[PDB]
Amino acid sequence: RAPLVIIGTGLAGYNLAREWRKLDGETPLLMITADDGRSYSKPMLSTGFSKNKDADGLAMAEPGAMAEQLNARILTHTRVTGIDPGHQRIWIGEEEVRYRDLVLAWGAEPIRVPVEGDAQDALYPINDLEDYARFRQAAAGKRRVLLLGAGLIGCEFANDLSSGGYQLDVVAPCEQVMPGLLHPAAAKAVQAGLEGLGVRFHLGPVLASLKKAGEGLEAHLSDGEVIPCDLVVSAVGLRPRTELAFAAGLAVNRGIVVDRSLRTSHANIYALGDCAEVDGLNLLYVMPLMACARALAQTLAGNPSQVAYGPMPVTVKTPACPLVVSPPPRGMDGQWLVEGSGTDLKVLCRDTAGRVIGYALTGAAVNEKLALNKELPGLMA
Amino acid sequence: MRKWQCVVCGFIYDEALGLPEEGIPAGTRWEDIPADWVCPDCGVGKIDFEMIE
């Protein structure tokens, strides 16, 4: 009688449901999502223009169709507003749902930045398919986009929006693209690639204010530059959605704290994907999420299983400058050395023993992904 | 020979080339690739690939 309840129809929620349904085809399944519930791959949002897709072209299946495939009831445009761990239930306004086990697959939230002026709200995040639809709606017939952020997500969009015909101005107070993730020299090559497409960078300033001016907007940066634009993309970064878990008394840190079995601090509640911090590791990518779905499915079907991340390199979708990066796992030190020249750069991180523990590859140098991957240590020891 | 693309990240498996370091020889058909095999770039199963050309 008691359902498995999954909050989320992203890649985490849908892949868990699918992996689990190979194991248990009888237990009722309820899926709940705040969006339209359509199946789609979020990674593809940053390639839509180069593939000449609109939002609907990126949808792979309607939620009703998924409901048949998974033998599930799927509630769409339904916001869970609380978790009641002491009574094994969740809240949706003033209605409740009992669960057998609850799975939190509710993702991460865009990082807001303070902006002034009478247009300070005209900032478009792109963190799901509906966001993408709302951005495309606003961008029709426009020429210029201001983009806030210079991480992986910001760089991918800047690349695709440029291929899509838009003239981009990227603003970010960090000193390099993809800070934290990327060695300076390889970041420089990626930035150069994007500039080659016409992207203009402003690294160091923030957006001070946004005002309505004539045909569109004027963006006043903190250094006094005024940049005419039609709309603004907010892609500063992401942080795991923790508010509802913490209020419910679940342990949180960077994300929702789970062990290698994906269990939270409370019986019958698990978490996976962008929202989950797995044994200290909150990794906002598909590869660890897939490992988690496979293991958690087993546990939910009564076969206690753990994840164990091997090497999980990051493939950055910037066609203007191809990039694959694998930062060294946490607790490991080494020296960085830049081999190659120009756009074809190979930056290796070696321990004292001479072993490659991390890398960044740009241009032609991405071909040697596979040979380097064999030497790599896992993200979990 | 056919090309198969990952619907999740866009990884292209080319039947003509194979993935010799996986290690899958050149000329290996999609059906003759082990069932447990995953996308090297995002980790989804064979179910998330579609034949493009």
Ligand SMILES: Cc1cc2nc3c(=O)[nH]c(=O)nc-3n(C[C@H](O)[C@H](O)[C@H](O)COP(=O)(O)OP(=O)(O)OC[C@H]3O[C@@H](n4cnc5c(N)ncnc54)[C@H](O)[C@@H]3O)c2cc1C
């Ligand atoms: C532009 C872009 C490109 C990317 N490219 C890559 C890539 O190439 N390779 C890679 O490995 N990773 C990539 N990533 C990261 C990857 O897409 C994410 O790690 C992954 O999609 C996260 O899936 P998720 O299901 O955990 O979260 P989400 O997809 O965000 O799903 C969260 C779900 O929870 C629901 N939800 C949230 N709150 C509530 C609520 N309170 N009540 C009910 N439902 C709720 C939402 O509606 C949604 O359905 C990219 C990310 C972006 C944005």
Ligand SMILES: [Fe+3]
């Ligand atoms: Fe893939």
